Design a protein around this ligand. Sequence first.
Ligand SMILES: Nc1ncnc2c1ncn2[C@@H]1O[C@H](COP(=O)(O)OP(=O)(O)NP(=O)(O)O)[C@@H](O)[C@H]1O
Ligand code: SF4
Length: 738
Amino acid sequence: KKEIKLSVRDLVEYTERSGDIDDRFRNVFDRAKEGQKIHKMIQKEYDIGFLPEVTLKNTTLYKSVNYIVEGRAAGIGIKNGKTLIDEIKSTTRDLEELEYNSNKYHWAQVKCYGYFYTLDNDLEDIDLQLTYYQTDTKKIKFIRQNFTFEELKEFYFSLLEKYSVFTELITQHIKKRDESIQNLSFPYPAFRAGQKYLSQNVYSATKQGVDLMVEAATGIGKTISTLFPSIKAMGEDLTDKIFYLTAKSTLKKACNDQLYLMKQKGLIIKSVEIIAKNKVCINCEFAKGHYDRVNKCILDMLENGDIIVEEIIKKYAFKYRVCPLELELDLSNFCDIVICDYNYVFDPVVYLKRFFEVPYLRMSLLVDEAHNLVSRGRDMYSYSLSFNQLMDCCDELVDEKKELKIKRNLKKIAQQIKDEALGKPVNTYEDLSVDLIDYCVRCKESMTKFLVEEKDKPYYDKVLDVYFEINKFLKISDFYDDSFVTLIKSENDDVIYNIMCLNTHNIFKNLLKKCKSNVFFSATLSPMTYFADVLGLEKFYNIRLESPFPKENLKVNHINISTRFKDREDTKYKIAEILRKINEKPGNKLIFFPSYSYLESVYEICDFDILTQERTLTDMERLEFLSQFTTSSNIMAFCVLGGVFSEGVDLSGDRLNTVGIISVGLPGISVENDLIKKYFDENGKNGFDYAYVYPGMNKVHQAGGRLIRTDTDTGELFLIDDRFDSYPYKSLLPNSWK
DNA sequence: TTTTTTTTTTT
Ligand SMILES: Nc1ncnc2c1ncn2[C@@H]1O[C@H](COP(=O)(O)OP(=O)(O)NP(=O)(O)O)[C@@H](O)[C@H]1O
Ligand code: SF4
């Protein structure tokens, strides 16, 4: 009844940690596919006897606790008469710096595998080996040592004793947590309309291990209707960790608020909110010694903490002088609910490697406002290189031998970009440039040694940047397949070399299979088959719940006036007349435009007071703008589709009574959107509908939902575009708006 | 045939 499930990597991480952060080497820009090619070549040099990728498992009773531990060896078999266990690892360190215990974590892991194999095969001795390789050089080194069963047993039991401090707190928390969840009731007086159907579908998806897409209108309560069923499934041992993913830092409060309410009702749970490094930094000196003190801060927080938020993290981090970022990544290993941005799961650079590399746990994702993951998902797998930045770094170097080789490598990359441009303002290529990748790798090797010996140099920051850009550019290039294209733009006195991800379906799908359950939900997720396709869902269930509000409180007026780009200057006065008549109505009014250029054009011919939105608006200014939407003002406001005021605004009651939308929201025709249109055309999809209509109409959907926020709120919606009564736009309009 | 605004976490 005392059981703790753990990976060998997680056991060694908390038992062998020591020293400072810079002593531990982390390459988050490692090209994995290239490394896996080296990994496979090493395993091809094995024998039919040396079996590869062998899973090793062990259950050991220690301190009355059953430690169920699992790991995977890269190879096991008899070699030279002795059984050999081989582990393959990528390294950025020099091979000469690699020796018997150079990396304690690596050798602790292979020793655990040895104890497992020796015990199950009556072996008395085993040879343990670490095969190290550098992905950019393909250089390989081997370190082989012999170990006795008794020595391995003593080492393994030592690691268990070091982890015992955590095991206990975890065991007691799981008992109290499941008890609280089993006795926990819906934290509100009664279920609202759709809540029972939504919760049941979320609970079933988590229990069966399936992907569920949900379009739920305002008023149904998407946060509690997703979190409560997910937490209940945790209390019934159906999932181990819940991830609440947000597209903006503001949306994390809703999840913490619902958890606070359930705590009041008896819920015993541990949650952590991950905050970006540049936001949780207290005020680097904690880096020295961090790994010698981080475990005790964790034990204090796990024992005395529940819902962990930014303030608490910084307090304990300052208290124990540990880096707050590394603290919170650690806490997420020991928390039940992880609240964090999409990047921590889907981005290739910052994803939580501890969880989404080799999952040994059941993970359930709750993706809030998933409509936002389409554009953002493409940005995570797209990157650029700029000729000007590379050349400007060259003009800072001072001809010193070390800087000269870097200056040369930078010029090679710059010339390769200019050559691939072919004197064309826009150039495209289906395949990735091997030469550009080769030049980027060489430049990286040349700058590495300088970065470690010249921090005093005054242009170090500029040189560190181009290093980051080329590193990240190389990392994105590892994903390049036939859902990518090369685009080279020659404008603004710069040649910008871009690797663009046109579709994230394959990459995201290979990520969602590592989780047990996935729930994508938003108020605007139409059509759900489009969003499912682009975000990697292949086998799934779709639930569309409509407004739980009275249909007599909303009045929708379609106005058939052409807003096509070629007719805007001709139809602007008709729009100005409609808006002037709207201005006569009582209450405040939000009028949305597809572009700033349209907003200013209509604004000019409007002879009445109008509050407009400017491109650059600080947080305070944004609060001032919305503050003028008093319940006693009579303000007409001009805003932009897809802008900061199209999402989030909660102008309830009489702060807003009229919303007007001027286009079907089509994105500006562009070469970026044309490549996306052509990709989907050549893959069996309506390209225009994928690149233009569906994102467009979804923006209309966003802005119109600013109007009715409560079942008491009433208002008028104005849809001004002859396309709102044409296909396919009318089908994409909400049923209440037609 | 069709005409854009803007968040996130990374050295
Ligand atoms: N059964 C319920 N009874 C009372 N209040 C509830 C109930 N369910 C949810 N709520 C509350 O109603 C609000 C719903 O918030 P949330 O789920 O974030 O948005 P929503 O209602 O889905 N609207 P939106 O996000 O704009 O589409 C919160 O204040 C909840 O606490
Ligand atoms: S305390 Fe701040 S500067 Fe120091 S390691 Fe942590 S995040 Fe970096």
